[PDB]
Each structure stands twice: as structure tokens, then as C-alpha cells.
Amino acid sequence: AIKKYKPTTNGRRNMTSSDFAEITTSTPEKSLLQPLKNNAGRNNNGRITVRHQGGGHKRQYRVIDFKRNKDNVAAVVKTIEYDPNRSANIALVHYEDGVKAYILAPKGLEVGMRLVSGPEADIKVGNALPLENIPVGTVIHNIEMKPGKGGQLIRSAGTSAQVLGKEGKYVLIRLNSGEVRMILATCRATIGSVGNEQHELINIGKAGRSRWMRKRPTVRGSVMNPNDHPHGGGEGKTPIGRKAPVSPWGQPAIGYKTRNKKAKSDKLIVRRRT
Amino acid sequence: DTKYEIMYIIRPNIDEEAKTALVERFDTILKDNGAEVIESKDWEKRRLAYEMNGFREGIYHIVNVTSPSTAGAINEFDRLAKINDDIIRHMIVKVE
Amino acid sequence: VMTDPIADFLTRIRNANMVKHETLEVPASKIKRDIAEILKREGFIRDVEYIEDDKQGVIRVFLKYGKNEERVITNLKRISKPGLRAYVKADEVPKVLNGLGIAIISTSEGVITDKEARAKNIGGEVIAYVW
């Protein structure tokens, strides 16, 4: 659940966080940890390519098994663990042959559940099947766009998609965004929705907490100089003073669609949203 | 215990052996989940008063069962019957 | 729940008397018998009899109507109530209708009428008026 802090200090005032009740351990799997460095939004050129990133707490990467292609044996859910890299929680699972792995923790997952993967897997929370074997109307997550590539869609905490129907070699899906699109039936997905649904309700509370989470301050263009931002300049506070608000590079910021107009996936996208 | 009666409609197209396999699968579901399948019969083959799932015909199969009320056999049958495509419509009613 | 069987007795008599019923029946209690016999010997009620059952017994009262079906008992009134008790000293004993009616009183000398109570010069609890 969400616990709210008493207003002992102005910073602490109105702050909320997760009780982490579901989390069952604080000892990640040494076998599956990998190092990660904070790129701080800088590319191989070393230039800041994405602003407002850097700093914050050090993290170790956890190797998630988005592929879920080990259909030989069932995996028993050993623990539910906190993952610094993703909004959702992860689940450590033991395969009966001794392979350890991490998966996204679906809503309702419990220690001891024996998950299965493959066409014969039953329609149970956490099981993974090719999209063709999933009955219509099912709620799924961790969808992969290309067979064997591993789940890519519907992985944030609390998100979910729904299977709407079949056609040809594709399966109709409503994504978390509400977009309805076709996806190759041979692709896999996991039954259920991503747990930790409460994540969105957290109130960060103070600037220092954003910094912990690796968000550097965001400066409004309206208070920059003309050579810095299209909105910069002017005496006193100023309105936008242009045809429309624009990014620092002049791209309109309100309502201007940026999807490629000749995208190859327009053939597979049935109904758009967002 | 409580006595239930489960009448469900198999799509008419189904093969005889496929129908038999489906019937035994669902009977096994009930038994394993904790019910006592005291009777299972192929009641009739009838036209539907109105088209159901685009079908005007179907095979009505009856299953009289008696299970502890708390047992989830009835609930599991509902889940699996709804998922399965062969069965058009299932009715589970308490019989006194 | 019933809280004053004495008042209920008086009201049973009043209702039966109003409709001029010949008889009435009540659950039997000592004080009810005392009131019934007082009325009997005062001539208000024609007759009294007692039946014994397995609950508490029963008392049956035969009403008295004069010639031309005239009602002998004008009315009954409960004086002392569970909500408020009414106790009268020897000199405080009342007269109902300047003596034409009677007042049933409970005393250490028993259940007696107003005339008897003042003759004995004792007070008590004014159970009822009758006239």
C-alpha cells in the first residue's frame, strides 16, 4: 500500500511512498546481477543528447527473462524483489532443473506459484504462451513484437493489454495506451497484468528525491535567453509570444504529431490513441 | 453437500470423438477440483430458439453433480467452459 | 410488555362493561382476586369465579347490568401507577362521588374499601376508583 508521512518537516510534508509490503527479500541474485553505469543522457560523442538526466543512486542491473522461452519445466516463484531499474517489481523463479531467472512480477503473483511456458501452459497468472494460444478477452503483459525477441510491450507497473481477436497470422491487441493493433500470432505474452499497480500514486514530496531517482532539474524555456530557447528573452515574465509553443529546437509542443508518416507499422495499427 | 445440474451446449459441428473427448475432459475437471459427478448424459441435439454465437443448432449435454458448496469445482468449470470454444453456453443451477 | 396487570384488569372490565358483555376473563393474581371480591361484595359485579390452570389460574367476572340493561359500573380508574405510586394517609382517604362510588385501597390490614379504611383509621395505597 501507500503510506503517507506525517508533516514533521516541510520537505516531508505531503510526501508518500510504498510500504513495499509485497517485497519479500532485499538480497538480489548474485548470479543475475550485471553492472550498469549512469550514462546521464550522454552518447558516444559525450554530448548531452537527452536533458534532465544524471546523478542519483547507483544501480545494478537485473537480467530479466523477457523471452520466457524455457518451456521444458515449470518455474517456482521463490521471491518477490524490488528492481531499481523498472517501475514494476521482479520475481526470482527457480526452474526445476536448477536455472535461476528473474521475471516481471504480475499482479497477484505469490511465492510458490509454479509458472509454465509454452503452448500447453494453462491460462494462469504468470504463464507465458504464444499469442495464438491465448483466448480472446484475456489480459496479458510482456508482449513481444517479433517472435523470439522477448517481451517489449506492456512492462511498466500496473499496465496491461487485452486480446481482442485473431486474423490471418496476426492477433488484435488493445495496448495499455488504448491503441488497437495487430501483432504476429507467433509472438508470446504473459497472462495477467503487471503488478505494483500502486506505483503511480506515489507523491515524490521533495526535490532531493527526484535527484535520487536521477532526474536533474528542468528549466523552462520562458526564462532562458533568446539564443538558448525560442521562448527565451523579453522583459519581465512573457507569454509564449509565438504561433505555438515549441521545444528548444523549434518543434511545436502542443498537438504536433511526430510519428513518422510513412511508418511501416501503419498497416498493422488498427485504431490509434496517444 | 449441494447438488448442481450443469447443462451446456456443444457446438453442433463437433466430431463424435472430439465431443466425447471434450465431455470427458470437463468431467475430469469437475472430479479433480473436488466435485462428485453423479451423472453425465448427452441430453439432446436441438435447434436453438435464437442464433447463439451464429449457431442455430447445438448438442445439449447434461451433467448432474454434487459437491461441497465451498469446493471450487463449479467455479473452475465456469472458468474453463467460458474459455473453451467448443461449448456455446453453460447453465449451472442448484437442484434441491 | 405489560407493566400493570391491575390497570389491565380495570381496563378489561371497562371495555367489557362499555360493550355490555355478560362476562370477562383475566389471568389470576392475588390482588386481582382481592379487587374482584371487593366489587362482588359491593354489588358492582354480579358474580366471580376462579379457575385453576397450569399457567397461573384464571378469574372470570360476570358483569351486572340493571333493569333496562343499565350499566351498574359507570367507570373504573387506576390511581396508583408503576410510574407514580399513590399513598394516602388515614385522613387523606378519598370519597368517590361523595361516597356513591368506592376506592379500593391496599393496607397492612389487607385490601379494603375507602369506607373500611377510614373506619379502621389507616391509610394505604389507593389502587383504584370505581363508580
Partner: protein
């Protein structure tokens, strides 16, 4: 006359479509108990059975 009473059947299956059909007007609508002469208790039981039959397709909703 309460046909159900005369037949003396205290259990009204929602499968006896022949039994149900004698209590619905054309178009599939249900008849009043005042029309059919039946009792109130059996009328309620008939309503439940007819509705169950309709949902399972034994009887028509309309027409």
C-alpha cells in the same frame, strides 16, 4: 384452473419446454397468472424456469 396444481408437479424444470410453452403467449411473452388461473407460488416458479430456458436458448426471447 391451476394447470400446475392439477398436474400436481411441485418441481418445474426449466427443461420441460413443452410444460413451459403452455404459459407464454405468441411472441414469447409470459402470460399473467390471472389469465392462466394459476397460483402465485407456481407463477414465480414458472417465471424463473421460463427465464432460465430463454437464457439457455430453449425458449425465444421475442417472436
Amino acid at each position: 384452473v391451476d394447470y400446475i396444481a392439477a398436474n400436481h408437479i411441485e418441481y418445474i424444470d426449466y427443461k420441460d419446454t413443452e410444460l413451459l410453452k403452455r404459459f407464454i403467449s405468441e411472441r414469447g411473452k409470459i402470460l399473467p397468472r390471472r389469465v392462466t388461473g394459476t397460483g402465485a407460488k407456481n407463477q414465480r416458479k414458472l417465471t424463473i424456469a421460463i427465464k432460465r430456458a430463454r437464457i439457455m436458448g430453449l425458449l425465444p426471447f421475442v417472436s
